[PDB]
TrEMBL record:
GO terms for cellular component: cell outer membrane. The keyword Heme does not apply. CDD domains: SusD. This is SusD homolog. Belongs to the SusD family. Gene3D superfamilies: 1.25.40.390. It comes from Bacteroides thetaiotaomicron (strain ATCC 29148 / DSM 2079 / JCM 5827 / CCUG 10774 / NCTC 10582 / VPI-5482 / E50). Residues 1-171 form the SusD-like N-terminal domain.
Length: 456
């Protein structure tokens, strides 16, 4: 049973909240299933269950769909965080080695993780029960789903509170943080900018682009404080690059979760692993539609081996392998990368367009383009000063840059809200068909929980 007598007890509990958060995103490949596969750019080789996700046929009778649709793993994070906040303060009184500052740091992390879990689950299910206190395992509070706006307002306030105590970096050489400091914790612990990144995204998801722009700006302007940088194509895709836990560029994972679920389970095949075919892949037709310029470093120049590019291998075969993420110990070690500077920079561009400041958006778009072999663009010459044309292009840049990082589906929804170029998709948004069904196991056990109308 968890105790709170010593610094080792609080350390273990804190690491447990991180572990639970990783598990929520990684279980059944949730992050990629919900973020990349759903109406995504991946062709499915053979699995009808994966094909149902891709088609948004989330009521089909597949066990995968039922498992992903059960939100328990998110409430596991929320409850563990709530318990930590209730019980950890006592440790300061019990163990002289656990300082008030150590408590403030730990509380801020678990508070931010809880808020992240809420945001993440709101994007998936929409309305979810807003639980703000701990409860016993095997029970769940008897309450309805709470309006998504109310849940996000709670998440925003919690993140702003956490930011007051979250540092940029943890510990010093003279005052270690749980035995390590500075660079040792970069890309491992939730930092002040990690919290700002969640705020920026909550705001963008709500259409509050004024706030999204301010928060994205703050992140970009303070990136050096957490040692976050723009990543080269080689460092993004290397076996020891951004997706590797102990990468030299690890600080560039503004928010992520490391392993001591992986996209590679779905994407890799021979020769990278001994599996004959990939479960999902980007087809040649898709590649040539999405990547329009042969100078694009993501899908252009060879990456050493014959028939390769930086994102894709086996270009001589009918089902090329999406090899961007390839942290191979099969057994994989790839980190979940929720966000990084390129994401936040493109978010800022999106926000600036939303605010009718398209000329300013172009400079941010160009930052990403010019680090990927693409020429600079200009608003008049390349977009005819058309705000919607520029918005569409910012989303194509995200489509390219963040491929396989759990963004595409959410990006399609934010894009649709701005572009309004597909009435069928606008109806899917208004009708709730952009969310997952609630698991019938949850509804049976908790009578106040109502199914999403779209999936009844």
């Amino acid at each position: 049973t968890q105790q709170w007598k010593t610094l080792e007890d609080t350390r273990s509990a804190l690491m447990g909240v991180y572990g639970l958060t990783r598990a929520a995103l990684a279980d059944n490949n949730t992050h990629w299933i919900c973020g990349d596969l759903r109406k995504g750019d991946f062709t499915v080789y053979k699995r009808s269950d994966l094909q149902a996700v891709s088609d948004n046929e989330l009521n089909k009778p597949y066990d995968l769909l039922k498992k992903v649709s059960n939100w328990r793993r998110f409430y596991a994070v929320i409850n563990a965080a709530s318990v930590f906040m209730e019980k950890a303060p006592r440790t300061v009184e019990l163990d002289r080695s656990y300082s008030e500052q150590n408590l403030k740091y730990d509380i801020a992390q678990v508070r931010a993780l809880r808020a992240f879990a809420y945001f993440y689950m709101v994007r998936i299910w929409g309305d979810v029960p807003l639980v703000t206190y701990s409860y016993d395992n095997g029970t769940f509070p008897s309450m309805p789903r709470t309006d998504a706006q109310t849940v996000l307002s709670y998440a925003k306030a919690e993140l702003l509170t956490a930011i007051e105590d979250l540092p940029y970096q943890y510990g010093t050489q003279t005052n270690l943080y749980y035995g390590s400091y500075g660079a040792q914790w970069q890309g491992k612990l939730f930092n002040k900018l990690s919290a700002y990144s969640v705020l920026a995204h909550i705001c963008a998801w709500q259409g509050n682009y004024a706030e999204a722009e301010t928060y994205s700006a703050f992140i970009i302007d303070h990136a050096s404080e957490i040692n976050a940088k723009y990543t080269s194509i080689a460092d993004l895709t290397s076996e020891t690059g951004l997706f590797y836990s102990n990468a030299s560029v690890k600080g560039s994972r503004i928010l992520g979760f490391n392993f001591a679920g992986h996209l590679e389970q779905l994407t890799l095949a021979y020769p990278l692993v001994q599996k004959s075919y990939p479960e999902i892949y980007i087809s040649k037709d898709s590649l040539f539609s999405i990547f329009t310029n042969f100078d694009d470093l993501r899908f252009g120049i060879i990456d050493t081996i014959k028939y390769s590019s930086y994102y894709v291998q086996n270009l001589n075969e009918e089902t090329p392998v999406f090899s961007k993420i390839k942290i191979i110990q099969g057994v994989f070690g790839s980190s979940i990368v929720f966000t990084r500077l390129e994401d936040i920079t493109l978010l800022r561009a999106e926000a600036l367009c939303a605010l009718n400041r398209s000329t300013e958006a172009v400079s941010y778009l160009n930052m990403i383009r010019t680090n990927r072999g693409l020429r600079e663009v200009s608003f008049k010459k390349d977009f005819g000063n058309n705000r919607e044309s520029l918005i569409a292009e910012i989303f194509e840049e995200r489509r390219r840059e963040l491929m396989g990082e759990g963004w595409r589906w959410y990006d399609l929804v934010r894009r649709q809200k701005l572009m309004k170029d597909n009435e069928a998709f606008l109806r899917l948004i208004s009708s709730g068909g952009i969310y997952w069904p609630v698991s019938e196991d949850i509804i049976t056990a908790n009578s106040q929980i109502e199914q999403n109308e779209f999936w009844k």
